Amino acid sequence: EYLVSPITGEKIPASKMQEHMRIGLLDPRWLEQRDRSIREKQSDDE
RNA sequence: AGCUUUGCGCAGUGGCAGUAUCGUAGCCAAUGAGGUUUAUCCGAGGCGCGAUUAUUGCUAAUACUUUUCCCAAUAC
Numbered sequence: 001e002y003l004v005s006p007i008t009g010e011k012i013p014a015s016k017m018q019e020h021m022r023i024g025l026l027d028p029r030w031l032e033q034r035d036r037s038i039r040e041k042q043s044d045d046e
Numbered sequence: 047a048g049c050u051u052u053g054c055g056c057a058g059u060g061g062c063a064g065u066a067u068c069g070u071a072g073c074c075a076a077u078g079a080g081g082u083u084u085a086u087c088c089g090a091g092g093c094g095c096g097a098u099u100a101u102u103g104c105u106a107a108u109a110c111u112u113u114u115c116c117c118a119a120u121a122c
Binding site for chain 2: 023027030031034036
């Protein structure tokens with residue numbers, strides 16, 4: 001179902017539109033925080 | 047042709063509070079979250095996890111000496 005994105009404007013259909021609204025608004029700082037957590041929580045000695 | 051309403055942006059001028067702000071390729075949620083009162087009634091976010099000066103950035107405070115010139119006859 002060729003819809004319109006209020007973020008980009010591409011023609012995303014009915015079902016994957018919802019996921020688009022969860023990804024297109026995902027905070028870029030979340031990626032940095034998750035990579036920081038991986039780097040900090042996996043370099044620890046037992 | 048002004049007047050005006052709603053929502054959304056960009057700003058400007060203020061006021062208020064730092065026990066709160068944000069994140070959520072984690073989960074659940076109008077096919078119903080949560081319900082202590084008004085329950086054959088109300089009606090949205092909630093939980094877990096994470097960051098932190100209980101939002102985050104800047105700006106400023108916490109010192110003087112290198113050089114470079116020299117003495118001499120109108121004489122056996």
